[PDB]
């Protein structure tokens, strides 16, 4: 099957069309401005540009399309999908009392955060006083796919989670549905399942098959995990980016409020997650990528630095141990930059190790192997340290681009996760 994945991320958007029979693919991209006063037009136009850059003979073969978007980016629209105010972005927080959400979700629910879609919807409710029932709140992915299939109030149980959805029971609470916000809530499907055929005019304009199906979407981080192709419980993806982000596939859902750990539903499984403030950003405080790699090549992995670092970029750690007061621990500083770098990498390695240990201690399926993403993935010495410390097979992820994972989502759904 030839399928199209669309990734709308934090800095831009990418389209990947893939024939999963010949395993052949094509990828195109657009870049966002740092700031916009009309993000809906930016995203919509980006969608059209992405479609345009894809070769016509690829578009003529695309059978299924899926879209991932940033988690917490929402749009308040009318019944026609027309935005009634500026979107609230993923990284924006709303000055609301979380107690106002208490009767709508369980006590340990991930939606109980000032940056959640639910919190934002409530913020809008307060701002407007009363919201018309014919209106709708849509995730970025929801709205963008709405541009393609024309079905209003449609979402997935990944995006809908922080809107107040409970994927463990597959429903919004009765209280939330019966409330003054219920009519704006979307119909929730499993990511990957067909929502409806592409709109005729869109298909004609972009030379797509009129029978091309538009699927339920997902989030960009989940799509990133889906790119790896890991579908066995105990398999994990480590993102060695600016911050170290761990995602572990598990048969058991786990969560922890203070460390920000929670679990997405993933077919019959659960994707548990945890993010440390430690990461590449701490490394960039001392070395540029070039010098970082050149110095990395000189490290003897059989030695130990004798340094016990906790490489925070600044005050406060979230995961594996929540500590808002913890300062960066980078003393002492050896004269040798090689030993110093080794201390740093050892620290980050400890962060990863203790991270997966933490997820397991919360009840998650024990770790079997690591697929690595992010800029640190190709650091061989670092991978050696991680291998020695963690004790499971570690390799570079086959794919890391969210658009590819979303393409796989369109092609096969979540069928592999049972």
Residue numbers in the entry: 2 to 419
Article, verbatim:
Synpcc7942_2462 from the cyanobacteria Synechococcus elongatus PCC 7942 encodes a putative sugar kinase (SePSK), and this kinase contains 426 amino acids. The At2g21370 gene product from Arabidopsis thaliana, xylulose kinase-1 (AtXK-1), whose mature form contains 436 amino acids, is located in the chloroplast (ChloroP 1.1 Server). SePSK and AtXK-1 display a sequence identity of 44.9%, and belong to the ribulokinase-like carbohydrate kinases, a sub-family of FGGY family carbohydrate kinases. Domain I exhibits a ribonuclease H-like folding pattern, and is responsible for the substrate binding, while domain II possesses an actin-like ATPase domain that binds cofactor ATP.
We therefore used single isomorphous replacement anomalous scattering method (SIRAS) for successful solution of the apo-SePSK structure at a resolution of 2.3 Å. Subsequently, the apo-SePSK structure was used as molecular replacement model to solve all other structures identified in this study. Our structural analysis showed that apo-SePSK consists of one SePSK protein molecule in an asymmetric unit. The amino-acid residues were traced from Val2 to His419, except for the Met1 residue and the seven residues at the C-termini. Apo-SePSK contains two domains referred to further on as domain I and domain II. In the SePSK structure, B1 and B2 are sandwiched by A1, A2 and A3, and the whole structure shows the A1/B1/A2/B2/A3 (α/β/α/β/α) folding pattern, which is in common with other members of FGGY family carbohydrate kinases. The overall folding of SePSK resembles a clip, with A2 of domain I acting as a hinge region. As a consequence, a deep cleft is formed between the two domains. After comparing structures of apo-SePSK, RBL-SePSK and AMP-PNP-SePSK, we noticed that these structures presented here are similar. Since the two domains of SePSK are widely separated in this structure, we hypothesize that our structures of SePSK represent its open form, and that a conformational rearrangement must occur to switch to the closed state in order to facilitate the catalytic process of phosphorylation of sugar substrates.
